[PDB]
Amino acid sequence: LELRLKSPVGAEPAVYPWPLPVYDKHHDAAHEIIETIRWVCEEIPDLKLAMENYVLIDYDTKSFESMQRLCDKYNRAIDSIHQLWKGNTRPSTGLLRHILQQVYNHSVTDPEKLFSPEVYGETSFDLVAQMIDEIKMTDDDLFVDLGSGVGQVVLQVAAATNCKHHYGVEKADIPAKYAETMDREFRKWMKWYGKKHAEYTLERGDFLSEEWRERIANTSVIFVNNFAFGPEVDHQLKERFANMKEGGRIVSSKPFAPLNFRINSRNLSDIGTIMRVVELSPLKGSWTGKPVSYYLHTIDRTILENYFSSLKNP
Numbered sequence: 001l002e003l004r005l006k007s008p009v010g011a012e013p014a015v016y017p018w019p020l021p022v023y024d025k026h027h028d029a030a031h032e033i034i035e036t037i038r039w040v041c042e043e044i045p046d047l048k049l050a051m052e053n054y055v056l057i058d059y060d061t062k063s064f065e066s067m068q069r070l071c072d073k074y075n076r077a078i079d080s081i082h083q084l085w086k087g088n089t090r091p092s093t094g095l096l097r098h099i100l101q102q103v104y105n106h107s108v109t110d111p112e113k114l115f116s117p118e119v120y121g122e123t124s125f126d127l128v129a130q131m132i133d134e135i136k137m138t139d140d141d142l143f144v145d146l147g148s149g150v151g152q153v154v155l156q157v158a159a160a161t162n163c164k165h166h167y168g169v170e171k172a173d174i175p176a177k178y179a180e181t182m183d184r185e186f187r188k189w190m191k192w193y194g195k196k197h198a199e200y201t202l203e204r205g206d207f208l209s210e211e212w213r214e215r216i217a218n219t220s221v222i223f224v225n226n227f228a229f230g231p232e233v234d235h236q237l238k239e240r241f242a243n244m245k246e247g248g249r250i251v252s253s254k255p256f257a258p259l260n261f262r263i264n265s266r267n268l269s270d271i272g273t274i275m276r277v278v279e280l281s282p283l284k285g286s287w288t289g290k291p292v293s294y295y296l297h298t299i300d301r302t303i304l305e306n307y308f309s310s311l312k313n314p
């Protein structure tokens, strides 16, 4: 006893066992099935016409026969459209949130072990989407998320941008191990829907290691949730940022330098002498979520050059 969903692009079908799994108090595989069908009907208007009107209205999630009739009415509609077609784009924001939730639900089987990953789609997703729209990224950029956890920020950026590569680095054992499954599941679900993503790597490691010193120096876009970082972690990170190229950017949860930094003879060693800092917020740019702010730092050594020029030409 199981339920099968045919891929809109001919990939291997989605197979769910019966009884259907329960993910948490606010997610179960039954609603995942219904929402997957609905998203595929939105991205394929012909499928909407083939699909009978009543099917996605009159349903019982606690009835095998009911859930099978629903799955079959979608599969028969996929088959009809696939026949009509006889005679890979980026996902929409809406579809991506659903894909990430799907990937998470299938990857983190014991959620007890872990703004937590559970609520990523309900809080963090929209802020990250807002960050992707603000920090414009090209095919020349290299993206790194320092302390990537289960890897959802990396998967979101990689599905939205055209960076050469996207990296996620996590030191902790439990999230780094879950990231391995998230990676496999993300690639599997993206192929299922027939969606394109940029290249990405989720790896285990310490971003303060010698290996990561040259790697940070060659990154053009760093995303770092530094809210909980200690003084030594913060001080070492600033040391790594100081080797970055002009125009290199760091997007963080707490600024690394004062927003009002004014260079003088007593603060010449501060990171503020080689970077610009701006507070950005979805409330500044029609937002209705949390009143949050993120901080954009841009490597600019002219701050330091101008100070010296002013001393020589007063």
Ligand SMILES: O=C(Cn1nnnc1COc1ccccc1Cl)NNC(=O)Nc1ccc(Cl)cc1
Pocket (backbone or CB within 6 Å): 115, 116, 117, 118, 120, 124, 128, 145, 146, 147, 148, 149, 150, 151, 152, 153, 223, 224, 225, 251, 252, 253, 294, 295
């Ligand atoms: O584990 C992860 C992402 N993650 N994956 N699954 N769940 C989560 C929890 O997310 C969050 C937790 C707290 C705050 C925000 C998020 Cl998004 N690390 N990466 C990461 O926080 N990036 C990041 C976030 C904000 C800025 Cl300003 C700069 C970088």
